[PDB]
């Protein structure tokens, strides 16, 4: 599903988080629990990107400046103006992070992991690991850098992931309560998502939840998605509102919607 609507909101979110955190001239630990293969060939042998990135990309000269970092990476990976490749989250991170930072990328699938070994590092410090990323949360936090962005992008192919994930974040948060945690989740079965969200809510009240809903007339497959952020940056709630408003003009316009909800200790 590379470059679908969920990738678009998740990756722009990532770019805004990276843009904020790199304001501080102290090293950042960047941890991905589910890195995938890192770059996606849109021309190999369903074109979901046509309804995600493609309308956004085609109209790029009309986008608000909050989209700049996201667009520039998509521009970079592609040889010309025709979309041939879509970057994965590690390709965004390597672009925005600095030589002083430390990237730790986890991937469980052997084929995907083998492709991830081929990502350029430029002058960044990139550790690629063939491992259960969710299990790694416990071992790697708190990091020596004492500053961390933990970007969690599960597939939720198992129902049990909706309870495993908040369990792992709760444990991680107990050991490193000042880390910036960002977890993506789908809306496929509202009940499962609501149970996931109740567990996320228990971890910390310094939180923001963002969601983007396509509102198709048939509730089949993923009809929307969201991200839950613990310790979100200064100014992120209002930036992300502009982003989400813009996206609803590209995805099912007239019917799509978004929401933003912050915890009891966030504004």
Tokens of 6: 């969920």
PDB resolution in Å: 2.0
- Of residues 115, 69, 112, the one with CA closest to residue 94: 69
Instruction: Yes or no: say if 147 and 21 are a contact pair by the CB < 8 Å rule.
Output: yes
Tokens of 11: 């990756």
Tell me how far apart the alpha carbons of residues 9 and 211 are, in angstroms, rounded to a whole number.
9
For 90, residues 6+ apart whose C-beta sits below 8 A from its C-beta are 32, 35, 36, 38, 103, 105, 116, 119, 126
Domain count, the chain: 1
Tell me how far apart the alpha carbons of residues 57 and 8 are, in angstroms, rounded to a whole number.
10
34 is in an annotated binding site: yes
41 is in an annotated binding site: no
Tell me how far apart the alpha carbons of residues 150 and 137 are, in angstroms, rounded to a whole number.
9
Q: Beta-carbon neighbour count of residue 107 at 10 Å?
A: 26
The three-state secondary structure class of 262 is strand
For 102, residues 6+ apart whose C-beta sits below 8 A from its C-beta are 27, 28, 29, 30, 125, 127, 143, 145
Catalytic residue (choose from 25, 41, 101, 153): 153
The torsion angles phi and psi of 183, rounded to 5 degrees, stand at -120, 130
Q: Where are the alpha helices (DSSP H) in the chain?
A: 5-21, 53-58, 68-77, 89-96, 110-116, 133-140, 161-175, 190-203, 236-250
**Structure solved using which method?**
X-ray
89 is in an annotated binding site: yes
Instruction: Yes or no: say if 108 and 161 are a contact pair by the CB < 8 Å rule.
Output: no
Q: Structural domain of residue 175, as residue ranges?
A: 1-267
153 is in an annotated binding site: yes
CATH number where 31 lies = 3.40.50.150
Instruction: Yes or no: say if 231 and 208 are a contact pair by the CB < 8 Å rule.
Output: no
- Residue 153 known to be catalytic: yes
- Of residues 66, 75, 83, the one with CA closest to residue 13: 66
DSSP state of 221: S
The three-state secondary structure class of 187 is strand
Q: Is the peptide bond before 257 cis (omega within 30 degrees of 0)?
A: no
């Amino acid at each position: 599903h590379a470059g679908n609507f969920a990738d678009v909101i998740k990756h722009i979110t990532l770019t805004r988080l990276l843009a904020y955190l790199t304001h501080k001239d102290k090293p950042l630990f960047y941890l991905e629990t589910h890195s995938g293969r890192g770059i996606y060939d849109l021309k190999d042998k369903t074109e979901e990107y046509k309804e995600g990135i493609n309308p956004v990309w085609l109209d790029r000269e009309n986008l608000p400046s909050l989209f700049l970092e996201y667009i520039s990476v998509i521009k970079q990976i592609n040889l010309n103006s025709t979309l041939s490749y879509y970057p994965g989250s590690p390709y965004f991170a390597i672009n925005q992070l600095r030589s002083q930072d430390r990237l730790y990328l986890c991937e469980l699938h052997p084929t995907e992991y083998n492709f991830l070994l081929k990502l350029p590092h430029f002058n960044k410090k990139v550790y690629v690991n063939h491992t259960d990323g969710v299990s790694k949360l416990n071992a790697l936090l708190p990091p020596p850098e004492k500053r961390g962005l933990i970007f969690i992008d599960p597939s939720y192919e198992r129902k049990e992931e909706y309870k495993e994930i908040p369990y792992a974040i709760k444990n991680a948060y107990s050991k490193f309560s000042t880390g910036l945690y960002c977890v993506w989740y789908p809306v496929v079965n509202k009940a499962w998502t609501e149970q996931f969200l109740r567990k996320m809510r228990e971890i910390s009240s310094k939180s923001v939840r963002i969601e983007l809903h396509l509102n198709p007339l048939i509730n089949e497959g993923m009809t929307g998605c969201g991200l839950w952020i613990i310790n979100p940056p200064y100014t992120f709630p209002s930036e992300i509102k502009l982003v989400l408003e813009t996206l609803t003009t590209y995805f099912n316009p007239g019917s799509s919607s978004y929401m933003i909800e912050s915890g009891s200790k966030l504004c």
